[PDB]
Design a protein around this ligand. Structure first.
Ligand SMILES: *[C@@]1(Cl)=[C]C2=C([C]=C1S([N])(=O)=O)S(=O)(=O)[N][C]([C]1[C][C]3[C][C]1[C]=[C]3)[N]2
Ligand SMILES: NS(=O)(=O)c1cc2c(cc1Cl)N[C@H]([C@H]1C[C@H]3C=C[C@@H]1C3)NS2(=O)=O
Ligand SMILES: N[C@@H](CCC(=O)O)C(=O)O
Lengths: 52, 101, 51, 51, 50
């Protein structure tokens, strides 16, 4: 549902949730109406998709 | 029961039509849940146009569009609301301003 | 959801009866007596724009 | 010269026959065929927007 | 129309209650509305040294 997130570069984690000390690997993802392919996003998105 | 189960523009307009013409009215739901067309093979009119052709109801008060192939078999009043066919899509996000804004 | 563009044609809704039903003419005169008093637009506002 | 505001109300142009004329049904089966075949709209365009 | 001088009217004849009393209108062929007209209030132009 939702949490106080504690998000890093290569991963994202959280605190004060319905469980604590569980963290998620970072990734990238298309959204509704796409618009991930928008070149001004896609440039930034393809960069954020990596720790480059 | 009666008519108060239903609320909407056509319910208001049905109440106005009744108040002018003096008759009482009973709102009823088309049994097949369609506006109405005539079959390719059996030529049966379905929908509310079916209901009207088969004498199910003296009058129809719904978003039923005045169309020529319906004027062949039933009569329509003057338009009470106008319109046109149009396009519905899911809107995109409001775009973030360009990097070179 | 969102609208785009214009409209491909223009049409309208009409109150319909079985052919030759006695209601056809007093219903037409009702629809006129209503629109000539703005009742149809007032009702449209009440169900589209006031909601 | 320029418009302001929108419409004040609804009105319309209809083809009008003397009451009970035998024109009254073929006129409607004509007009509704012009609407369902898009002929009225290019009759509007040809005069408001081309010209 | 009403006094038999003309067999049909095809013109910008507005459909009204007080006219359907005496003549039969088809379904409308063109929508409209009442509106206000005025002189165009100086859609202006800047100067080159504005
Ligand atoms: C209104 Cl107020 C009245 C009528 C129409 C549309 C509107 S509005 N401005 O969209 O709310 S209509 O759909 O064009 N049908 C007309 C008929 C009434 C009367 C006969 C026709 C034209 C006059 N009313
Ligand atoms: N685009 S327009 O104003 O010239 C216009 C407006 C209208 C047209 C046709 C045109 Cl071209 N036909 C409709 C009528 C046709 C049939 C269906 C509704 C009515 C009956 N009335 S309307 O919706 O008022
Ligand atoms: N079309 C109008 C006349 C012109 C006008 O009033 O704008 C009518 O039929 O009465």
């Amino acid at each position: 549902e939702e949490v106080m997130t504690h998000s890093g570069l290569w991963r994202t984690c959280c605190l004060e949730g319905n469980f604590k000390g569980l963290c998620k690997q970072i990734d990238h993802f298309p959204e509704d109406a796409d618009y991930e392919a928008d070149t001004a996003e896609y440039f930034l998105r393809a960069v954020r998709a990596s720790s480059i | 029961e009666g008519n108060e189960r239903y609320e909407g523009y056509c319910v208001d307009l049905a109440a106005e039509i009744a108040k002018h013409c003096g008759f009482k009215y009973k709102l009823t739901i088309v049994g097949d849940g369609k506006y109405g067309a005539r079959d390719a093979d059996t030529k049966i009119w379905n929908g509310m146009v079916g209901e009207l052709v088969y004498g199910k109801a003296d009058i129809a008060i719904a978003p039923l569009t005045i169309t020529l192939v319906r004027e062949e078999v039933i009569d329509f009043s003057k338009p009470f609301m106008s319109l046109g066919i149009s396009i519905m899509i899911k809107k995109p996000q409001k775009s973030k301003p360009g990097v070179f804004s | 959801t969102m609208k785009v563009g214009g409209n491909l044609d223009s049409k309208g809704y009409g109150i319909a009866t079985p052919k030759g039903s006695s209601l056809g003419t007093p219903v037409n005169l009702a629809v006129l007596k209503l629109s000539e008093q703005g009742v149809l637009d007032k009702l449209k506002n009440k169900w589209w724009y006031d909601k």
